[PDB]
Amino acid sequence: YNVFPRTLKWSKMNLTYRIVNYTPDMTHSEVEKAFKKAFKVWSDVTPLNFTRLHDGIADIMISFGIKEHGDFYPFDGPSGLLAHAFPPGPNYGGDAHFDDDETWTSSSKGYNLFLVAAHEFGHSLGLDHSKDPGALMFPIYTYHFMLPDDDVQGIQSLYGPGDED
Amino acid sequence: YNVFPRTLKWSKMNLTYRIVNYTPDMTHSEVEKAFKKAFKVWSDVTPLNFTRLHDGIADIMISFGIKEHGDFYPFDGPSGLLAHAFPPGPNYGGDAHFDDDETWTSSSKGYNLFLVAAHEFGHSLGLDHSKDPGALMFPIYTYTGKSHFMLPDDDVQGIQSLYGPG
Numbered sequence: 001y002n003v004f005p006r007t008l009k010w011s012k013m014n015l016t017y018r019i020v021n022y023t024p025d026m027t028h029s030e031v032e033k034a035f036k037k038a039f040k041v042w043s044d045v046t047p048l049n050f051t052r053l054h055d056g057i058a059d060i061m062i063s064f065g066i067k068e069h070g071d072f073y074p075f076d077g078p079s080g081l082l083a084h085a086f087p088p089g090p091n092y093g094g095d096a097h098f099d100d101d102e103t104w105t106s107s108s109k110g111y112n113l114f115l116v117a118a119h120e121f122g123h124s125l126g127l128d129h130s131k132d133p134g135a136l137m138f139p140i141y142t143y144h145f146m147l148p149d150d151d152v153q154g155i156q157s158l159y160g161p162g163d164e165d
Numbered sequence: 166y167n168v169f170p171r172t173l174k175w176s177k178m179n180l181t182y183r184i185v186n187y188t189p190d191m192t193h194s195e196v197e198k199a200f201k202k203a204f205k206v207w208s209d210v211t212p213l214n215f216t217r218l219h220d221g222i223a224d225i226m227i228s229f230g231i232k233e234h235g236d237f238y239p240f241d242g243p244s245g246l247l248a249h250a251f252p253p254g255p256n257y258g259g260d261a262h263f264d265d266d267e268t269w270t271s272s273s274k275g276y277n278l279f280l281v282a283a284h285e286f287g288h289s290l291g292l293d294h295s296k297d298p299g300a301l302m303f304p305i306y307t308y309t310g311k312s313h314f315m316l317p318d319d320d321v322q323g324i325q326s327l328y329g330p331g
């Protein structure tokens with residue numbers, strides 16, 4: 001027999017993601033670079049591996065959308081809600097949605113897609129919010145990034161450290 | 166930091182369920198009898214007790230639906246996904262949804278409701294799938310053709326590992 005796991009997490013270390021569509025604000029390359037970097041934040045401190053799928057069903061389906069876009073968490077136009085992601089699980093579990101009424105950037109302007117995506121993928125992997133004000137998972141946006149210690153401690157609690165050197 | 170915490174077992178032994186609606190395929194009496202029996206499988210070998218509520222909120226809300234039916238885990242028409250249930254917890258936790266594009270039966274012409282429900286309630290109580298090929302929680306539907314169902318030992322051991330014996 002098997003009882004359900006203690007915590008919500010992926011039962012496998014090899015995870016796929018798919019960029020379903022793209023924002024007007026950045027090139028395909030810029031969007032791809034930002035998400036690859038944001039996944040690397042987490043894979044660097046765990047045994048998790050992330051591979052991009054161009055089509056088909058991936059574990060973490062990424063999309064840009066506005067207002068009602070197919071779930072119980074409609075977006076709200078510019079500012080306010082920037083994005084959201086669902087905890088590990090089947091179907092919409094793990095998926096990350098970005099509000100395309102925001103201006104997404106690879107820089108300090110608008111909202112940095114990398115930074116917001118890194119926070120989102122924290123959710124996709126099983127982290128909720130932190131009370132550590134320096135944490136990536138501290139639910140307030142601010143802008144060489146290094147994953148703060150609270151976030152490392154949190155993610156490793158779920159997946160272990162993987163290779164430590 | 167915080168993780169998403171998972172209620173590994175119900176912290177109370179007395180649980181409620183509500184049959185929110187009913188399949189076209191069986192009488193109300195047949196459906197009530199199937200679910201009652203499905204709960205009895207688990208209460209027979211633990212201290213868990215199940216009470217039926219007719220109105221309002223219950224721990225385990227039972228409903229029949231098709232396609233997209235309120236949780237964004239849509240059903241898929243005849244065959245394939247037959248049903249699903251949520252692990253223990255508040256709100257959706259414990260609830261069991263049955264795809265009414267399936268033919269549900271008291272006997273063998275379609276999917277036996279009692280059998281699938283017993284599996285579902287295993288999930289509602291905190292059991293994942295077993296690798297024991299004879300287990301109720303082994304994820305392939307089979308039908309013995311026997312009037313009596315005996316909960317396989319693997320499932321007994323599993324459920325007892327959370328709630329203990331009766």
Ligand SMILES: C[C@]1(CS(=O)(=O)N2CCN(c3ncc(OCc4cccc(C#N)c4)cn3)CC2)NC(=O)NC1=O
Nearest residue numbers: 081082083084115116119135136138139140141142143
């Ligand atoms: C519900 C909501 C609202 S939301 O859509 O408004 N939301 C998303 C993005 N989020 C955020 N993103 C990046 C952050 O990094 C902080 C940081 C740490 C260290 C260095 C640097 C640097 N340099 C930055 C922090 N918080 C703010 C909250 N959506 C959701 O997914 N969570 C939610 O709270």
Ligand SMILES: C[C@]1(CS(=O)(=O)N2CCN(c3ncc(OCc4cccc(C#N)c4)cn3)CC2)NC(=O)NC1=O
Nearest residue numbers: 246247248249280281284300301304305306307308309
């Ligand atoms: C995801 C899915 C798919 S599903 O909807 O297709 N699914 C439900 C039902 N399930 C099943 N139900 C009854 C069983 O009893 C076995 C048994 C043992 C001993 C004697 C007799 C006898 N007589 C029977 C076995 N497996 C098969 C898988 N949904 C879900 O809740 N789990 C899932 O795998």
Ligand SMILES: [Ca+2]
Nearest residue numbers: 059091093094
């Ligand atoms: Ca997913």
Ligand SMILES: [Ca+2]
Nearest residue numbers: 077078079081
């Ligand atoms: Ca917004």
Ligand SMILES: [Ca+2]
Nearest residue numbers: 224256257258
């Ligand atoms: Ca419930």
Ligand SMILES: [Ca+2]
Nearest residue numbers: 242243244246
């Ligand atoms: Ca089906």
Ligand code: NA
Nearest residue numbers: 100101102103
């Ligand atoms: Na935009």
Ligand code: NA
Nearest residue numbers: 265266267268
């Ligand atoms: Na039916």
Ligand SMILES: [Zn+2]
Nearest residue numbers: 069071073097
């Ligand atoms: Zn969404």
Ligand SMILES: [Zn+2]
Nearest residue numbers: 119123129139
């Ligand atoms: Zn967040």
Ligand SMILES: [Zn+2]
Nearest residue numbers: 234236238262
């Ligand atoms: Zn459902």
Ligand SMILES: [Zn+2]
Nearest residue numbers: 284288294304
């Ligand atoms: Zn199952």
